[PDB]
Design a protein around this ligand. Structure first.
Ligand SMILES: [Mg+2]
Ligand SMILES: [Mg+2]
Length: 1260
RNA sequence: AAUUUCUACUGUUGUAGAUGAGAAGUCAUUUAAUAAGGCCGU
DNA sequence: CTTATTAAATGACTTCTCTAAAGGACT
DNA sequence: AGTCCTTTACT
């Protein structure tokens, strides 16, 4: 039945399995007797510090390599001119002259870093363990003789002396870093990878500096006035200093002009993170301490000018920051608050503040509490001349009016009509002008609903009491302080103290808001002489003395926030090593002594055994011979990895090249690499074009050399005839496919048992809960995949292979063992629908039991579909099957809504809906859980938790362990209905959409290797014949619009559209003036009233209306109810009745059918057209929520679409109509796949007009 | 309320489904504080 | 609501490896 | 001349 019986074993992929190692017998006593666990704990803790130490030198190495770098200006100019040409031109002269302009600058930078002396040894044993003479140990000694303190920065390392001791630790362990070095090789690789400084510099930062140059020379034309240049040369003078101008090549250091920083040739001063910062600060500006105002930057000046002149085109020029330089550690040019290191720095800094604010005394020798009560009681008693005392015309004045009158613009517009009773905003506003303007404002306002000056004098009269709110709290605070006055405990961010953190923050909040209440009075000395004001000097004298002392809260608040929001340190798992720098690194028999790990099977149980470093001859052929018996089945593992490297390494080995004796012709082929089309020639030689005859000649040389090799003839290779090969990666493929064998040896239980006793071998049981004797019923997909690693039916035709480089980990207990539900005590079942309301267990149940002991773990890499390697043009094979089978395929489409995390409509080749249902509640889920609410409240809790400085819990596992459920319902749907899955790209234009994206990713990854736990191991769908229906994930950029049976369509006009007629609202009717209304409506064709039906009718054509992309003659009725959300909430509006209420206001007669078209556009009134363009917005508003979708346009029967009542083949509400119309764009996409012709390229871009034509005319 | 680990579970020393790991780097977002500004509050 | 700066946090994205045996250094 | 940790081979 299934159309995918053939999409199996399409390509190989990598996976890793995890198990628990249960130690066996005396291994655990023998381990700790050698204290191997505590020892590895410390060697992780050093390995971290070791790579930290190294990086400090890769840091020095990046910076000196890059101030040496220079890019030839006319090379940049070659990139720029070509880079913009890529925009608005698709030409392949361009693509070629761009990849050649990009590759030459990377070549220029890669040559530079490849020649330096530090580079050679950067990745070998001489970096830390120079055999005779070592690079890092010099650098640490240079930087100690220069007294430069590299490890002030990180707490875990004291001085440079300690950092020597830690590099010394890894004497014989240079290989242990090989993978780390891999991560560092990546930092410099010229290849097209984002981990590289060369990639960051050419792919990331150059474009961004070029976009800003285009935005700098295009800003000057449209808004010359935007940037106050003189002030940024006076504010940002530090980060305009550039020693070299690279357009002039002058070497003197002097402050640049912006015209110079945007010299394309000066991009060279922004290569390092120092100059990245400087460029970014010209963009962003900086704070300074002592300065109250913040020194602005280019991006702010663009912003402030565009809100001044009300031009929102200027936003197009917001400059882009440059990404930090890779591996760079960097502090900012803007001020950075001092940090707290422990609790004791939190109690001390609090005391000293709240003490001064109690101890401080004004000039007049009056406390902060007395100065304010005196000052404010005086205002409520109106003893103060109100012209003397002003408010700041600020967000602070706006906050006042909201707090006291419950609308912000109240004070604003009250003083704007009393002035008129051209004037600028005043910097400050007097209290008298406030009391008069609102005194006359309330004269016009209603007596019930009016805002009195006496409500303002309420707010402040009451300020003094905030200090008695604080005094009793600053006193139980004294209790809490004693608890944490401990010189480095740092045990206050431990979630147990969260009740005490709530107390400390309410102090800090009450004292913050009190500041934000006084703030409206303060007259900052921000140096403006443009205006001055004549205050009440006495009041301002002793106020502004108080205010400054309280202002010292905002640096206090940040420090405490910044220490209590810190996540507490957590003990994690660490690697285990059992004394081998190279442990489990390679399973092969010949490496068993170098890598210590061996596997065993006994009685369908799996074991891992790791010999003592001192006894690794334990399992040599001798010991396997005199200890053959029927106990344990040792796996013996034979691999030939990477044939393309390994057959040349071994045949042409200086050791053994003479024995294999290649002819001077085969050497010819090797040195010039004629056997390959893009392979490397031997050093000293030049690469020659690929010669097929040479290619089979070489392959034959390999073939003879494999039978001459003593060991590799044991594999039993059955190659194709070398005249079948067209390329040498095909021979390598056979060598690798058949270079992997698993045999066994039976070993006396008595032998294993006495060797495990003596600590000669550490034996574990590889375990998950399916290897429980009690486990009946489906194993995890992972248990399947591992058991097949050794199944006889896997081993005749290998589809599951066992990768080298497996790891073992220790995990210390993390929560106390608590017996959450005692044994034989019934426990109630959470499922209200279960038959058993409770259930009793003969045994104890312990919550999170896996975490109440220490455990050992085994991570194991495997390779799937081992033999059938790779798939190019995968989509092309999918598309091929789909064309031929396109009558049979169904479209599953999946949309997101506001109500729905995800929704699905299954539609057939016609357009009928087979299934439609939500995913807010799964299955078949015996415990209905509306996950839309579960996540909703888990997300609220987090925003709530961020604000009270409580711990921020993870949402991703909740979300993932949820989509895991729907991708299971999506696999079942696709295989059963022979479907393709169609999603929305991302009309329709961040947390509800990442649960939608997260679904797509777990579905692409699950369609990579789909196994039905139920299908027979031997046949398609099962362990050996697993469905592959998606091409492997690489980049979202490389992936594009299709990845297998998954497709993406443009998502426009899927929400708002009629399912039955295809109508869409593109009129976009808005009102601005009477003339455009009286001009829009006339553009109609007919506006009549239907008598026999009882609504209004607006017949028209779209083309006549202004926008040109508009095709179709439609008739749109006011039939039905409708919804609209107002602030008093939503109300039911009948527009058919709302129009009757408007015509009879303005005397138009409608009750006999006469077309009213002419009457409306003749009338002058603004109100008349305002409710009419409104009742038109409601006539066309198809989605109505508080939820359902309604349609004005009749079908042939003259009926109108309502989601409340629709057949099963049509949507049930606007959300399913969303996904239904994604599936209609899929039905379109199916089309172009069926009617695709051979040799051609599929087109997968739907334009809105080919869509409209297809949804509009399908029904009609 | 048990887990290689995650979710929901009682599915009975576990049930269903999911599960590519280690290292490395980078980016985006949220919330808070702050600076200057906009508008038919939030 | 914007444009910015600092801090603390969670999350998501692109790189590399998933080896046996040659080869050399200390012994 | 044996042990065993480090590079090696290519693309
Ligand atoms: Mg199970
Ligand atoms: Mg749980």
């Amino acid at each position: 039945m299934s159309i995918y019986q053939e999409f199996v074993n399409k390509y190989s992929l990598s996976k890793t399995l995890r198990f628990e190692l249960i130690p066996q017998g005396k291994t655990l006593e023998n381990i700790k007797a050698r204290g191997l666990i505590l020892d590895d704990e410390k060697r992780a803790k050093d390995y971290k510090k070791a790579k930290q130490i190294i990086d400090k030198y890769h840091q020095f190495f990046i910076e000196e390599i890059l101030s040496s770098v220079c890019i030839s200006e006319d090379l940049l100019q070659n990139y720029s001119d070509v880079y913009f040409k890529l925009k608005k031109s698709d030409d392949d002269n361009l693509q070629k002259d761009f990849k050649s302009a990009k590759d030459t600058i990377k070549k220029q930078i890669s040559e530079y870093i490849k020649d330096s002396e530090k580079f050679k040894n950067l990745f070998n044993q001489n970096l830390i363990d120079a055999k005779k003479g070592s690079d890092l140990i010099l650098w640490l000694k240079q930087s100690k003789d220069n007294g430069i303190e590299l490890f002030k920065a990180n707490s875990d390392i004291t001085d440079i002396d300690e950092a020597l001791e830690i590099i010394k630790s890894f004497k014989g362990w240079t290989t242990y870093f090989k993978g780390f070095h891999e991560n560092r090789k990546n930092v410099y690789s010229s290849n097209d990878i984002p981990t590289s400084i060369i990639y960051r510099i050419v792919d990331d930062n150059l474009p961004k500096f070029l976009e800003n140059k285009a935005k700098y020379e295009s800003l000057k034309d449209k808004a010359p006035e935007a940037i106050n240049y003189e002030q940024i040369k006076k504010d940002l003078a530090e980060e305009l200093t550039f020693d070299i101008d690279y357009k002039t090549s002058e070497v003197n250091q002097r402050v640049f002009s912006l015209d110079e920083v945007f010299e394309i040739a000066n991009f060279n001063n922004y290569l390092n993170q120092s100059g990245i910062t400087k460029f970014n600060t010209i963009i962003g500006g900086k704070f300074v301490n002592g300065e109250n105002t913040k020194r602005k930057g280019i991006n702010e000046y663009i912003n402030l000018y565009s809100q001044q002149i009300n031009d929102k085109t200027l936003k197009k020029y917001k400059m882009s920051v440059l990404f930090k330089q890779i591996l760079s550690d960097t502090e900012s040019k803007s001020f950075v608050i001092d940090k707290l290191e422990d609790d004791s720095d939190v109690v001390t800094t609090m005391q000293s503040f709240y003490e001064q604010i109690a101890a401080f005394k004004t000039v007049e020798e009056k406390s902060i509490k007395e100065t304010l009560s005196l000052l404010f009681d005086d205002l409520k008693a109106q003893k103060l001349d109100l012209s003397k005392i002003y408010f700041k015309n600020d967000k602070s004045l706006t906050d006042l009016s909201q707090q006291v009158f419950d609308d912000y613009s109240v004070i604003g517009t009250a003083v704007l009509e009393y002035i008129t009773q051209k004037t600028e905003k005043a910097k400050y506003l007097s209290l008298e002008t406030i009391k008069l303007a609102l005194e006359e404002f309330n004269k016009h306002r209603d007596i019930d609903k009016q805002c009195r000056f006496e409500e303002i004098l309420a707010n402040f009269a009451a300020i003094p009491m905030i200090f008695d709110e604080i005094a009793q709290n600053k006193d139980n605070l004294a209790q809490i302080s004693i608890k944490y006055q401990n010189q480095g405990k740092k045990d206050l961010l431990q979630a147990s103290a969260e009740d005490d953190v709530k107390a400390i923050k309410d102090l800090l909040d009450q004292t913050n808001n009190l500041l934000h209440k006084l703030k409206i009075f303060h007259i900052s000395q921000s140096e403006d002489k443009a205006n001055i004001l004549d205050k009440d000097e006495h009041f301002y004298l002793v106020f502004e003395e108080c205010y400054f002392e309280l202002a010292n809260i905002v640096p206090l608040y940040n420090k405490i926030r910044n220490y209590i929001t810190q996540k507490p340190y957590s003990d994690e798992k660490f690697k285990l090593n059992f004394e081998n720098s190279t442990l489990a690194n390679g399973w092969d028999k010949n490496k068993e002594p170098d890598n210590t790990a061996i596997l065993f099977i006994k009685d369908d149980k799996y074991y891992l055994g790791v010999m003592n470093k001192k006894n690794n001859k334990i399992f040599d052929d001798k010991a396997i011979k005199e200890n053959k018996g029927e106990g344990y089945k040792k796996i013996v593992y034979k691999l030939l990895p990477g044939a393309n490297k390994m057959l040349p390494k071994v045949f042409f080995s200086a050791k053994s090249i003479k024995f294999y004796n290649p002819s001077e012709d085969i050497l010819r082929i090797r040195n010039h690499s004629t056997h390959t089309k893009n392979g490397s020639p031997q050093k000293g030689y030049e690469k020659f074009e690929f010669n097929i005859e040479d290619c089979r000649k070489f392959i034959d040389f390999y073939k003879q050399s494999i039978s001459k090799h003593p060991e590799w003839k044991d594999f039993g290779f059955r190659f194709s005839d070398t005249q079948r090969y067209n390329s040498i990666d095909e021979f390598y493929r056979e060598v690798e496919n058949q270079g992997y064998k698993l045999t066994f040896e039976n070993i006396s239980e008595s032998y294993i048992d006495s060797v495990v006793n003596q600590g000669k071998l550490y034996l574990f049981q590889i375990y998950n809960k399916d290897f429980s004797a009690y486990s009946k019923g489906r194993p995890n997909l992972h248990t399947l995949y591992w058991k097949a690693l050794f199944d006889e039916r896997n081993l005749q035709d290998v589809v599951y292979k066992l990768n080298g480089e497996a790891e073992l980990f220790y995990r210390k207990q993390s929560i106390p063992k608590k017996i959450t539900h005692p044994a034989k005590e019934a426990i109630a079942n959470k499922n209200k629908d279960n038959p058993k309301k409770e259930s009793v267990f003969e045994y104890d149940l312990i919550k999170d039991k896996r975490f109440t002991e220490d455990k050992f773990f085994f991570h194991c890499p495997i390779t799937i579909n081992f033999k059938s390697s790779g798939a190019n043009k995968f989509n092309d094979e999918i598309n091929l099957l789909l064309k031929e089978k396109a009558n049979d395929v169904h479209i599953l489409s999946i949309d997101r809504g506001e109500r729905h995390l995800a929704y699905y409509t299954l539609v057939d080749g016609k357009g009928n809906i087979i299934k439609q249902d939500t995913f807010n509640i799964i299955g078949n889920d015996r415990m209905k859980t509306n996950y839309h609410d579960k996540l909703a409240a888990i997300e609220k809790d987090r925003d709530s938790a961020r604000k009270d400085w409580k711990k921020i819990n993870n949402i991703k596992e909740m979300k993932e362990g949820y989509l895991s459920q729907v991708v299971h319902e999506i696999a079942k749907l696709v295989i059963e209905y022979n479907a393709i899955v169609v999603f929305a790209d991302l009309f329709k234009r961040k947390v509800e959409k990442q649960v939608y994206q997260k679904l797509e990713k777990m579905l692409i990854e699950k369609l990579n290797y789909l196994v039905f736990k139920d299908n027979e191991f031997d046949k398609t769908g099962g362990v050996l014949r697993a469905y592959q229906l998606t091409a492997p994930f690489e980049t979202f950029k490389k992936m594009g619009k299709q990845t297998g049976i998954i497709y993406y369509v443009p998502a426009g006009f899927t929400s708002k559209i009629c399912p039955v007629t295809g109508f869409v609202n593109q009129l976009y009717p808005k009102y601005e003036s009477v003339s455009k209304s009286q001009e829009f409506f006339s553009k109609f064709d007919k506006i009549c009233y239907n008598l026999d039906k009882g609504y209004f009718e607006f017949s028209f054509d779209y083309k006549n209306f202004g926008d040109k992309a508009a095709k179709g003659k439609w008739t749109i009725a006011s039939f039905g109810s409708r919804l609209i959300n107002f602030r008093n909430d939503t109300r039911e509006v009948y527009p058919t009745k709302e129009l009757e209420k408007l015509l009879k206001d303005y005397s138009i007669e409608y009750g006999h059918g006469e077309c009213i078209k002419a009457a409306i556009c003749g009338e002058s009134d603004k109100k008349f057209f305002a409710k009419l363009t409104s009742v038109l917005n409601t006539i066309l508003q198809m989605r109505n929520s508080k939820d359902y979708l309604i349609s004005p346009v009749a079908d042939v029967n003259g009926n109108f679409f309502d989601s409340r009542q629709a057949p099963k083949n049509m949507p049930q509400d606007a959300d399913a109509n969303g996904a239904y119309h994604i599936g209609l764009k899929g039905l379109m996409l199916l089309g172009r796949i069926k009617n695709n012709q051979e040799g051609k390229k599929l087109n997968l871009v739907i334009k809105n007009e080919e869509y409209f034509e297809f949804v509009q005319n399908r029904n009609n």
